Design a protein around this ligand. Structure first.
Ligand SMILES: CC(=O)N[C@@H]1[C@@H](O)[C@H](O[C@@H]2O[C@H](CO)[C@@H](O[C@@H]3O[C@H](CO[C@H]4O[C@H](CO)[C@@H](O)[C@H](O)[C@@H]4O[C@@H]4O[C@H](CO)[C@@H](O)[C@H](O)[C@H]4NC(C)=O)[C@@H](O)[C@H](O[C@H]4O[C@H](CO)[C@@H](O)[C@H](O)[C@@H]4O[C@@H]4O[C@H](CO)[C@@H](O)[C@H](O)[C@H]4NC(C)=O)[C@@H]3O)[C@H](O)[C@H]2NC(C)=O)[C@@H](CO)O[C@H]1O
Ligand SMILES: Nc1nc2c(ncn2[C@@H]2O[C@H](COP(=O)(O)OP(=O)(O)O)[C@@H](O)[C@H]2O)c(=O)[nH]1
Length: 468
């Protein structure tokens, strides 16, 4: 059978879309006949009406995702897959005889901040998993905690944290390293040759189940290594519990990460508070169509300790949840300390727990929070708005899309496409256009975002059947 609610909602979406098309073509024909102030006023009233109409269609699509048991099914399937992957990682990480285990050695001390260093460990872990090597994490003299990883997180194994082997060598590829018991992996920036066990590909054995359950299987797969790595020590778990209570952290909330200080001009622009808060307001308008919004609440994470005062002053209708001493702790004077380490971990935790995330994906901090968010919901792939980049994993293989409809360029800034063309995406301008390279032409420019599909890449990974 099909579900009655499913059929009602599908037809309501289709009728809602058709009515939006009738409304668009009528109101745009009217706009053409106006000028100056009447044109401004008409356009503004039109945008307000379109926002409500658009949000009704998105609300119906949310209900369609849940109806007739689909929500319960998605939650059960996502749980089954996480448990499966976590069991395979635990099995890899816990050989019975550490002496005789194949191993991959990772050093945490890359020359960068916490999110960049966590992503380096994820990259090491994913290649460990692909090559059937126990991950050994070397973390003495960590700039955030001289005592290492186990200052905050559980060790990465219970049975095998020792580097002993009959042979050691620097990574030279799976074929040359086949009989080398312990391989040392460099940073992805220096890795040659590259093995296939890198983002944004996903394991061939899971790909059908992942595409069915999740809008971005690449992030979900990265998130399973993040989930395993950041298992907290009991003292940190107690600190998060009591932080939750003391901050009055509560739902609904929108996470906002504002990255300023040394990021600006090197790796990102300065974005004013108003640019984040436009998307927070829009998302609360959407949530209010399907739930009670007690108070509009924002969890603010920032390395600018003057921002919180600014935000409260400009948005007195909003409840801001923030630890301003964490913001202070993140300045360049204090950043590489255990105090600042606990601060970034807490900010990332609360961001990742929010209903929605507004930030710059140019920041490794926001990307870690978005990856953790994937572990907390069946499919949180769409629960963000980036002011700059799309999701990426530094060191990833080429992010390709496939043109599904033809594009004839209207300006020289646009690229042509025919269906089938491989597009290397550089980003989404959040205005209906993306920028990328039509591979076949080597032309870079703009294309309508709706005219491409994501190319899921799969890789033959080990499946660790003895983990069952
Ligand atoms: C030695 C050492 O320790 N080095 C560390 C270093 O590892 C560490 O991390 C690096 O930080 C910089 C952040 O500055 C990262 O640079 C940014 O990388 C992204 C992602 O690029 C990949 O994916 C995109 C699609 O999202 C794609 O277009 C790219 O080509 C690229 O894919 C590549 O394909 C190859 C095929 O084999 C692979 O071999 C490569 O591995 C793969 N590359 C990577 C890096 O994975 C990129 O999007 C960013 O570019 C934007 O930002 C810069 C400014 O920083 C602008 O100059 C660019 O024009 C572009 O701007 C964007 O343009 C879009 C389209 O118009 C807009 O929509 C966006 O809004 C706008 N964005 C911005 C911010 O303006 C950067 O290139 C690098 O990935 C990090 N690497 C790792 C491993 O973590 C840094 C951390 O600070 O410390 C060093 O010390
Ligand atoms: N507590 C806290 N620290 C931050 C914040 N934003 C930046 N930082 C600090 O600055 C570092 C920036 O390095 P990294 O995490 O690699 O991210 P990126 O430079 O933003 O891409 C973080 O790891 C923190 O140490 C924040 O919102 N809160």
């Amino acid at each position: 059978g099909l579900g009655k609610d499913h059929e009602i909602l599908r037809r309501r979406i289709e009728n809602g879309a058709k009515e939006l098309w009738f409304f668009l073509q009528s109101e745009l024909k009217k706009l053409k006949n106006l000028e100056g102030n009447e044109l401004q006023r008409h356009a503004d009233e039109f945008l307000l009406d379109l926002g409500h109409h658009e949000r009704s269609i998105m609300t119906d699509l949310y209900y369609l995702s849940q109806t007739d048991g689909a929500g319960d099914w998605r939650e059960k399937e996502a749980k089954d897959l996480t448990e499966l992957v976590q069991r395979r990682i635990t099995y890899l990480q816990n050989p019975k005889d550490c002496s005789k285990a194949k191993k991959l050695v990772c050093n945490i001390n890359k020359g960068c901040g916490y999110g960049c260093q966590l992503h380096h460990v994820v990259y090491c872990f994913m290649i460990a998993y692909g090559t059937q090597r126990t991950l050994i994490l070397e973390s003495q003299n960590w700039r955030y905690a001289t005592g290492g990883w186990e200052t905050v997180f559980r060790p990465v194994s219970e049975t095998c944290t020792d580097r002993s082997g009959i042979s050691t060598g620097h990574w030279s590829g799976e074929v040359k390293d086949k009989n080398v018991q312990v391989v040392e992996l460099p940073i992805v920036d220096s890795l040659h040759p590259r093995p296939p066990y890198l983002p944004l590909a996903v394991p061939e054995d899971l790909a059908d189940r992942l595409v069915r359950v999740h809008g971005d299987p690449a992030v979900w797969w990265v998130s399973q290594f993040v989930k395993y790595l950041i298992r907290p020590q009991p003292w940190l778990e107690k600190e998060i519990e009591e932080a939750t209570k003391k901050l009055g952290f509560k739902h609904p909330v929108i996470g906002v990460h504002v990255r300023r200080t040394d990021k600006v001009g090197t790796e990102a622009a300065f974005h004013p508070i108003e640019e984040y808060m436009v998307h927070v307001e829009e998302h609360f308008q959407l949530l209010a169509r399907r739930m009670q919004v007690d108070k509009k609440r924002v969890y603010l994470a920032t390395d600018d300790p003057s921002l919180l005062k600014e935000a409260k002053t400009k948005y007195p209708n909003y409840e801001f949840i923030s630890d301003n001493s964490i913001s202070w702790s993140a300045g360049l004077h204090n950043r590489y300390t255990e105090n600042s380490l606990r601060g970034v971990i807490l900010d990332i935790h609360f961001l990742s727990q929010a209903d929605f995330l507004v930030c710059t994906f140019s920041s490794q901090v926001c990307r870690v929070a978005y990856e953790i968010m994937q572990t907390l919901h069946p499919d949180a792939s769409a629960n963000f708005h980036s002011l700059d980049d799309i999701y990426y994993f530094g060191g990833q293989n080429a992010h390709n899309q496939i043109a599904i409809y033809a594009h004839q360029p209207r300006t020289a800034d646009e690229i042509p496409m025919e269906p089938g063309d491989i597009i290397g995406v550089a980003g989404n301008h959040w205005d209906g256009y993306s920028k990328g390279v039509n591979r076949k032409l080597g032309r870079t420019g703009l294309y309508p975002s709706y005219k491409v599909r994501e190319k899921i890449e799969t890789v033959k990974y080990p499946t660790y059947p003895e983990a069952e």
